[PDB]
Amino acid sequence: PIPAETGWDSAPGLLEGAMTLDLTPEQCDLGYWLRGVAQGTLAGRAETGHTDAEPTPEHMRADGPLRDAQVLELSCRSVAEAQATRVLAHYVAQAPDIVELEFFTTQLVDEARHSMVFRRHLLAMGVPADRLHASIAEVSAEYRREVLEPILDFALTTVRDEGDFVGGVAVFTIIIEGVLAPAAELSERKWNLLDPAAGAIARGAAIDEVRHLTVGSSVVRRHLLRRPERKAALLDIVRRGREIWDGIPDRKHVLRREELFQAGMREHADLLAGYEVWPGQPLLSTTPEQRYAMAEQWTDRMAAARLVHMGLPEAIDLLRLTD
Ligand SMILES: [Fe+3]
Ligand SMILES: [Fe+3]
């Protein structure tokens, strides 16, 4: 009996699961993760995230804008997930008790796995093994400096330097993953047909992320119930997260890879045809600006549900993106 929310076929989508499920760290202990994720979600997918029935097509190995789009995105994601692993190590170190120790251990290994399958897809796309880590660093350097390091510094300052465990979980789950998971859902929808291996990689990570998002919400929710006087402190953390994001040139980087993806779609439009990136919307008929704005809309929709569940509805207006 593998749980329904971890099953490769039975698991909800990312936004769907994060907005509807209630998972607690108590429920998602290490035994749950070993049986349900390592032996469940990842059965037959341990080394690369995907099976042989889900190829890296030759058009993803051939030089061109579609490959350039995936190389840019997965170089950035692989670095982001590796740095997140290092930051999450402090959440394990300072976990208040065994229940959080176990859950954030599982999330730490999840993020390290995400980093691994993203970098291994770069190899499957013909990045030379002896150039892998240096090309990853070259391609992602501007993104790491301008986007990744500011938000992970915020999490690190909050958990390590200030010793605020639930404050740091609020940072990681509201300001980081809450903000970035909708682009991950969009990534899976964009790539499912053009790069089946990458679609399947994204799918497994999204199932993990349902758990990360719902459990992080539970941690914040339970803290706020036990210590209602801490609401003000949580809201100021959220306010500072918004200010940090406002100084980050996120749109510039997203549109860079969406313009590459757009030129790549042009070369494989026969394959896409009527494929819909979301209901009633063929992927071919979207622009970079339109996919960016839809990811922001998804961010707002998920944030309204999650912040309500956490008891921080006052944070919704602070974080609203669609203006
Ligand atoms: Fe991840
Ligand atoms: Fe995650």
Residue 137: closest CA among 152, 119, 116: 119
Q: DSSP alpha helices (H): ranges in 129-177?
A: 132-143, 149-156, 165-170
Q: Which domain holds residue 299?
A: 2-322
CB atoms inside a 10 Å sphere around CB 184: 19
Residue 174: closest CA among 22, 311, 294, 322: 311
Specify binding-site residues: 81, 111, 114, 177, 209, 212
Q: Beta 276-278 vs 281-282: how paired, if at all? A: antiparallel
Q: Give the distance (Å) from ligand 2 centre to CA of residue 115.
A: 11
Resolution in A: 2.0
Q: Give the distance (Å) from ligand 2 centre to CA of residue 155.
A: 14
Nearest-angstrom CA–CA distance, 157 and 217: 20
Q: Give the distance (Å) from ligand 2 centre to CA of residue 285.
A: 30
Q: Give the distance (Å) from ligand 2 centre to CA of residue 108.
A: 9
In the beta sheet, which residues pair with residue 281? 278
Q: How many domains are there within the chain?
A: 1
Question: Which residues have CB under 8 Å from 32's CB, separation 6+?
Answer: 3
Q: Give the distance (Å) from ligand 1 centre to CA of residue 76.
A: 12
Method underlying the structure: X-ray
Answer for the pair 206, 188: CB distance below 8 angstroms, yes or no: yes
